[model samples]
Target chain A: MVGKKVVHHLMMSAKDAHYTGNLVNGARIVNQWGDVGTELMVYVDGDISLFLGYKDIEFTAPVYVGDFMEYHGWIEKVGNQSYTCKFEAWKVAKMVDITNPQDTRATACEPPVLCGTATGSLFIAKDNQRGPQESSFKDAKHP
Target chain B: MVGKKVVHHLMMSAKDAHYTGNLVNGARIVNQWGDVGTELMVYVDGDISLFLGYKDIEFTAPVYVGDFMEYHGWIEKVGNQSYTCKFEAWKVAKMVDITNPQDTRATACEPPVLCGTATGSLFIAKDNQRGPQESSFKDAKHP
Candidate 1:
């Protein structure tokens, strides 16, 4: 049931790190996927839905401050009233300094380093309908 | 071994609601546990440990605006360089309206309605250590 992927990019700042200046907390990193998760729901359900829970989340690698991260997500499964989402975050590039925003590395450009991964579901109830399904999701089955 | 526990309470406002005016997202509730998770680590490691990730999480029920939530967490297991923490959030009470902040129900005490639960580990490397371990978790094993 995967459909209409969402990709978002942003930089983690010093404010996002707890104590390790460069290492951002996993929660904060996962929070970056929140908007994309919402996007996936809107894409599939054509309405705003509430998050259920993550079956599991892995902080595979470290994300540094000034590092640009990409949040990607897509619908994995569609339940009667919920849609499971698969989301991932990676360190695509780093803002080394003011002048050099893009830090080059191995290969032609910066390689994405997997920072985090998570699987969760979002559900919208019938009684709590926010709006009608949009044209994009007309083929999607409604619960 | 378990260490000093962290208990926090907050009233869910309209801003935290996802789509429904009162309905809040499970991710939002778990996100609230982030601060308590950080406190758990600071109490033990005396430094901020990043969330490795949640092993599992469950959204047992729903939370709504004007509802007071209590976040409770404690160390469930200790590791060489990480600490496993179990956390839960629940709606303890509710405000009838904005004008009547004290218009509540359920006599005698806080009636907790389970909202969510999660188990996650936090880790801090020695090089990233900020300070000596606080006295609260002196008995906890360290790396």
Candidate 2:
């Protein structure tokens, strides 16, 4: 099945900051890619799948502490035992006042800003698949 | 200025495993990429540079607990205030005994199996770059 997508939303916490000026480490973004891929695979295959790799992974913007992030992963192609998926990480909101570190108020991004993206592949061994496979999202828009 | 590289060598620890079968979380691998980039940026710019993003990040093989990983990052292109870099994560060694988890012995990988790779870009404000920038590895082979 193709076009199956999962979303993860979280507000960046102080613990996430690894650099000076409250900047978050880039690895956290990639880690989001892993969780998204794993969830999609489990939903479709009924088991955790092995991530073969990723292609064309890009980080377009910076992420900082107190930023609200939206991470999405969707299936793009399906094969007998392998699946190709695409991912996007977005900054949907941020804290309202930088000067007031205590202020937790947020201002939403009118249009979500994309921070990162990638195409990844995962595989479930034929023996590990626990289902009567169906085209779960075969008819979903590919664009 | 290009061809500057930094290497990070580490062994997967027991605490690094996040899944069944002692598999290390993919996030740890990406975190390695972050450290490598920050190190390279600081060496060249005399300050931590902002990571603009990465391209074509690929995880070719699975990384498990007890694996010895060697991460390499290098500069491929340079601009007035931005630098493009490349990264590689290799499984240079793994535990000698999979059947006995108690054994901590390791066997070297003859050719150092590559587990992942990526191309990344970093930026420093013109005012932040320490002067006297030069091609540290100008004579190094790119191929």
Candidate 3:
């Protein structure tokens, strides 16, 4: 069913920073989207189906090390063995004063910074899909 | 300067594959796009400027372990501090019979499979840009 949603939260670690200015590569966010897609498949079909591809992906903002990220995904369309999903990544909190070795301060984003967005497709083989065709998002607990 | 292009080749290793059925996550290809963006920046600006964002990204096909990939990037627009570039990923060769332990066969694609594509922006500070704004793609030999 359409409109089923999943929310995920993660913090960018020092390891995620791949550039000179502590900038995290956009692909890290892309990878997180893949995880979200997996969760969506598991939620809807009772299995972790294969991710097929992404469409209309856009990265609007840059992410940095120690940034707190929030990701949201929702089902847009569903077919016999495929689902089209939309995903968004936002910076909920940002780490600052990175130039100072001793300074460790993080500030909450007043309005979250939208970092990236995408639409993706996932596929489950006919035999692998065990579904009632309804989403349990309303009853499930997620952080 | 709009048609300047750079091409890169790589092989997907077993470590890059992350799902059942030898399917690779789409993020690995996205990361490769990031690398290609960096190379485009280095070729055009003589520096690895920050990759700001990507737009119009599309992953049309799936990638798997042992797939040989080719990526092509070209300049589309240029600004004082930014360069808008286009990128594409192709599967030049595909590994078959992944489930068969004894089979290590690979087949070349008659026409490369276009797996992914994106348009990205890279930012280089004025002081950091060491360039005549002329691409040496015609002179430098690349494989």
Candidate 4:
């Protein structure tokens, strides 16, 4: 079964930082991918499977602190022991000014900026998997 | 004028967790990609640019709380306003066991696990770019 997915909404915090100040670097999206991919695994199998790899990943924009971003992943195809998923992260908010990159959450005037996308695969343990009827993603949150 | 790279070494922590416990979900690797990509941009141009997106991303393994991960990225090619990069994250350590998931860092015997790979691209602001000088990464450390 396909279209099963998970979404993670987060604020790019100081914790996701690098040598650079405040700007959420493009690679951190990988972690978000990790987060969402886990949800997908949780949906398909009762166990949290390990990510085998991703096919392609793209980063679209810069995310700053206080910016709201969403990471999402959905199963596209299921294999004997593998599952392929389409993963994406988007920026739903922005800073009004660069001077004060914090504390000023802007109005929702902008359409969410798509920050990244990918096709990833992970390995689920057979023992950890549940049948179709009991799969967590069978009737997941469509959002 | 290609193959410009950057590396980021980090310890996977409780912060990078999923609902399934201390298992590091894939999303944090996105942050690592973000970090490495930023270093590449900073090295290319004096300025830090926004992440446009990733090309292909793969998650190869489950990264745990005590694991050490290195996220790396390099310039594969560059255009007037965009820089394309190859990115990867590797796990360099493991928890001695699940019980005391901390402080028992073992002998670094195992080969670092190549957990994820992706091609990511970022945007370079025309004004911020320094027009490439002496950049590093002729040969990267594949450890």
Candidate 5:
């Protein structure tokens, strides 16, 4: 299969708190990105019945609330039912620092630092009887 | 050491994206939460340097542009520099689904099905001469 690049933007909310200040728990980043990973896997494999695993990861920067961040992923390699996808994240607009007051540290940061990047292997079950059949990407054309 | 609860709100941006769609990546979750099996290693032992492994992960939801999500975390247990921290995420205000123009979904669902959880260990290196330094929580204090 050919490598495809997909991009998405995500916001931080009260529920995604990591520190007492609600600075933006790092796990949320994983959750958001993981969603994209699964989508790409299903798109490529056309199956969602199989389970996926993350073999490696790295956090280069931080994420926050009221921050408009972008996620970019591309298929690095493809295996039988598995593929390696790589991704990165960044801030696109002004963000609020709920933790700090009268500082405007959030907006000041503007375009924050390079949050991080990750790579993982996604697999889909070939057996149609195991779980929900994977959706076919060929039919759904991306404009 | 007493177990502590910390919360933070993280913002997403272009730098955070791994794909053109700007959605968060899957492996990013593993980086934040570490690995489920090695929970004691990442959170309790404070092994921030260690890279935990992720198994059987599925992304059932989608996060997008102009969307704000929340992540909450608390220390479940502590051991030396490591501890087990539990985390969860939710959409706060709004979500921008680029793929679907008219997508309208409520923020909360039944029981908030387990999106995923991780057990992470973190450790702060101290200078031999400095002796055992104060806990990082000291700085996390709001006042």
Candidate 6:
């Protein structure tokens, strides 16, 4: 099967704040993904029982109330009943480069900074035969 | 304060599903806003006993395992002890175009189609002084 990555975006609300501006809260991110990911997973596995866990997680950008953030993830490695995934986010905009020698305005498409990633283990239930064959992940590996 | 809109990407783990592909059964996006809004209510009304409620809601997109999606929201209206907000989602690359051109390409830079939206009301104590002042929401009105 062709393994693919997906991206999602969410707006931080007044309810999304912590003390004032911190938007890296795992709980909030997880909540937003719940709706965004479920729809896709169903198409891939035909059900949600195959979900497992997250491995490496890193937050690279600050999510603010008005920032339009992007998230991307791919199946980096696959295993029996489990796989590793990588994800990241970036601020979409052109900014003035303060670090440049000439201080020129750079249309900075910042390399997607690591938002956070995880390795998860999933299992196709013995009785659930609606998903892809179990052998789909045998040779998957993370680089 | 000047009302602003923002979008963020999210991913769901295997455990987030209730009936497999349906992430809606797992959690609510408003919950992600967390205590920031709730605390504001409790602090402003001197009544930590008050509860906020969602007046209206709409789900516009289908979430999936690898599908990148975006959630967008902004302040629409505010009241003495309540605020009205709106939210929507779009599948990052797979959204269908309903415009006259009927474009079908997976546009990465194009905004995702609307998935869903909601209007909510929050209540705080009358004497509490923690939430936004009356003037704070005055600027939230659209021109």
Give each model's whole-structure lDDT.
0.72, 0.78, 0.78, 0.70, 0.49, 0.41
Residues A64-142, model 1: lDDT tens digits? 6677788888777777777788889878776555234365432211578888899887777765544424455556655
Fnat, model 4, is 0.88
How far out, in Å, is residue A47 in model 2?
Answer: 3.0
Candidate 2 wrong stretches, greater than 4 Å: A1-3, A132-143, B1-3, B98-100, B132-143
| lDDT per residue (tens digit) for residues A20-61 in model 2 | 888888778878788888887776666678777776677788
**Candidate achieving higher DockQ, 1 or 4:** 4
Candidate 3 per-residue C-alpha lDDT over B15-46 given as tens digits, one digit per residue, 9 for 90 to 100? 88787777888788778878887887777767
Global local distance difference test of model 1: 0.72
Q: What is the two-chain DockQ of model 2?
A: 0.62
lDDT of 4 at A103: 55
For model 2, the docking class works out as medium
Model 4 Cα shift for residue A65 (angstroms): 3.4
Candidate 4 lDDT, B1-143, residue by residue in tens: 36455779978777766645577667677767776777787777656678776555666677777778888778877777887788888878767774565567554527888988887778876767665444464332111
User: TM-score for all predictions?
Assistant: 0.78, 0.84, 0.80, 0.73, 0.48, 0.40
DockQ of 3: 0.51
The docking category that best describes candidate 3 is medium
Compute the lDDT of residue B45 as modeled in candidate 3.
65
Best model number under TM-score: 2
Off by over 4 Å in 1: A13-23, A97-109, A126-139, B13-23, B97-109, B126-136
Name the 10 consecutive residues with the lowest summed lDDT in model 6 chain B: B98-107
Error of 5 at B72 (Å): 19
Q: Deviation in angstroms for A68 in model 5?
A: 1.8
Kindly report the interface RMSD of candidate 6, rounded to 1 decimal: 15.9
Better of 2 and 6 by DockQ: 2
> Native contact fraction of candidate 1?
0.56
The ten-residue window of minimal lDDT in model 5 chain A covers: A128-137
Chain B alone: TM-score in each candidate? 0.82, 0.84, 0.87, 0.83, 0.51, 0.55
Candidate 4 lDDT tens digits, A76-125 = 87777787788888888766774575556575527778877888787776
